[model samples]
Target: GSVREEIESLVQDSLMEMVKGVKNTIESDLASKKGLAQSTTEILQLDPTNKAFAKSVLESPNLKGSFLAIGLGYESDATVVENDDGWEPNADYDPRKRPWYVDAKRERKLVVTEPYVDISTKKIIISIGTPVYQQSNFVGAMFYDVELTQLAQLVNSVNLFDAGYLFITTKDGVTIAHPNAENNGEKFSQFLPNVDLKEGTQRIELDGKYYLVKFAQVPSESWYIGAVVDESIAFAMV
Candidate 1:
C-alpha cells in the first residue's frame, strides 16, 4: 500500500519539474516586454509630443499592437496618444486617471495590473506600465496591453495526463489560466482549502474522488503552476 504512495509522489516530482520550465519561460517573456516599455518611456521623455517618434516606438515588431497609449504630463493640460483601434476616442478620457498610470506614477517604477476585461474587445487583458520622469519631476507613463489568451493557450498545452490538467494561479490562489473556462477566475481555496500551497504534494478528496495536486512557483511574480490528477488514473500507470 505504501509503495503506491511513493509512486504517486514520484509522479508529482515529474509534474513539478515540467511546470517549472514552462513558468520560467512565461516569466522571461513578460520581463522582456516590461523592458521594452521602460525603454519607450525614456524615448518619450525627450519629446513627449512628437507623434512620429511615438509611432515609431509603437510600431516595433514585438510591440506593434500591444502598445495601447502613452500619456504625457505637462505643466498644464495633459495629452494621450492612442494606438489601437479598440480604444475609441473619448472626449472625457484622461490618461492620468487610468489605473495603470496612477499605479506606475505612485510606485515610480514598472507595474503590472490585475487581469481586466477590455471594453471594446470584451477579452481579458493585463496592463503593464512604466513611469516617465523628466529630471526630478514626473512627466508621464507608457502603458501596454497584453491579452491573456496567449498565456492561457501556453499553459493549457502541457500534456500531463489523459484525465488530469494544469492550471496557473496568482500567489494569492486566484486562478488565471485553466483548461476549463469555469475554473479560470475561480479560487483554489474552494477546492483544496486546507493544503499549504508552498508544501510539496497533497492528496485531497473532491466530489467523492481523490485528487493528487502539486504546485511549482514561478520566480517572476511567485505565481503557481498546479497539476491535478485523478488518484485512480495516477496509480493505474503502474
Candidate 2:
C-alpha cells in the first residue's frame, strides 16, 4: 500500500541511463584537462618561460575554448607566465599563494581544486595544476583554469515532471550545479537533512511537500547528480 516505495523504484530505474551521460561527460572533460596538464608540465621542464609554447597550447583548437588560461609560476621569482592576464593583477600577485599552485607543489603531481567563483570574472571555475621539475630540482608549476558553464549547461538540460529538477553536489555535499542558484556552493544536506546519498531513489520531505529524489555518483570525481520530482505528480499516472 506504499505508493512512495512503488514510485521510487519506477523512477530510479528509468533515470539511471540519464545520469550515465552526465558521468561520461564529466570524466571525458577531466581526462582532456589532465592530459593537457601533463603535456604542459613536460614543456615547462624544458622551457619555463616559453611564450611560444604557452601560445601554442592556449591557441590550439582542442584547448582554445576549453581553458580560461594556462600558465607557469616560477619558483625562483614567483613570476607568472600565463596565456592571458586572468590572474589578479595586483602588484603583490604571487602564484605561490594560489590554491592550484600551492596544491600542485604540495602534491608534486597533477591536482584539481574544488569549484569556486572567480573574483576576476564572477564565473564558477576550477583549476588543474601540476608541478614541474628539472631532473631532481623543482622549477615551477603549470596550471590551467576551467569554467563550469559547459557543466552547468549539461545539468540544466535535463527536465522532468514539470517541477522536477536536477543538480550536482561534491563529495562533501556542496552543490556545484543546481537549478536554484542559491543552492550553488551550499551544502545539499541542509536542503534535506535526511537525504540519502546512495545511488538510488527514495522519498524525501522538504518544506511540507513530499518528493522523490534519485541520485547517481560520478565515481572518478566523487560527485553526485540528483533528480527530484514532486510525489503527487509522479504518482498521479501510476
Candidate 3:
C-alpha cells in the first residue's frame, strides 16, 4: 500500500518549521554580546588586567561566572598565566600546542574549543576565543573559559524536555558541552568510530544507542553547533 509522497509533505514542512524556530532562537541569543559576556567572564577575570570588569559581572546576579578572551592579533605566545588571587607563575599554559587552538589563531576568527584541563586548577574548562578588530586591523582576541560543571547546570535548565540530552563539541570532536560531567572531554569520533563528519548528518550508533545528529558552523563565530536526538525516544511519540 504505497501512498503518495505529497501526502506527508505538509507534516514534514511543519516539523521543519518548528526546528527552524528553535534553532533561530538559540542562534540569535547566543550571538549577542551580552550572551557572550555572561557565558565567558570567569576566565577573563582570572587575569589581573580584566579584574575590574570581572568584578562587576560577579556582583551582578544576572551575570554568570564565565569569561572569554579576545585575540588582539595573531600571536602564538599569548597565554593565561593568572587566576583571581594573583599571577600564578606556575600557571603558564600555552594554547599553541593544541592543533585546534593553533587553527583558530591562524584563521583569525572566533573559535570555541572543547572541554579540557585548565592546567591551573586541573579541572575541565571550555574555552571560546574571538578575534578583536579595529577599523579592519586585527588587534587581538578575547577568550571565554567556562567550567563544564557550571555549564552542565545551564544546559539542563534549558528545558529540552525528554526529547533527548544536549551535546556540543568542537569541530575536532572534543566534547565541550554535555549534561553528563564525566562525558565532557571524550572524543565523539572515538566513540562512534564509523561516523563521518565531513559533510551532512549521519546516523551514529555507539554503546548500543542510536543518535540522529545534525551539525552546522556558527557564521559569526567559527564554533560548530550540533543537535543529537535519540532515535528510539524521539520516534516513540510518533
Error of 3 at 47 (Å): 17
Report clashes for each candidate as comma-separated counts.
0, 0, 24
Q: In the order shown, what is each candidate's alpha-carbon RMSD?
A: 3.3, 2.8, 7.6
Q: After superposition, how far is residue 5 of candidate 2 from its true place, in Å?
A: 3.0
Sort all candidates by lDDT, best to worst.
2, 1, 3
Question: Positional deviation of 59 in candidate 1, in angstroms?
Answer: 4.3
Candidate 1 structure lDDT: 0.69
Question: Where in model 3 is the C-alpha error above 4 Å?
Answer: 1-83, 91-116, 124-154, 158-163, 206-210
Whole-model alpha-carbon lDDT for candidate 3: 0.49
| TM-score winner | 2
Predicted structure 2, TM vs. truth: 0.83
lDDT of 2 by residue, 139-160 (tens): 7777788877666787677766
In model 2, the runs with Cα more than 4 Å from the true position are 49-62, 85-88, 189-202
- lDDT (Cα, tens digit) per residue for candidate 1, span 1-238: 8856875676676667656666566556677778877787777778765767776767665667544443343333566566664565466767777667788888968898766555556565677877876665776676787766656776667665664777777777877887775676668776556656774678788778787778887655657878777777767764
lDDT to native, each model = 0.69, 0.74, 0.49
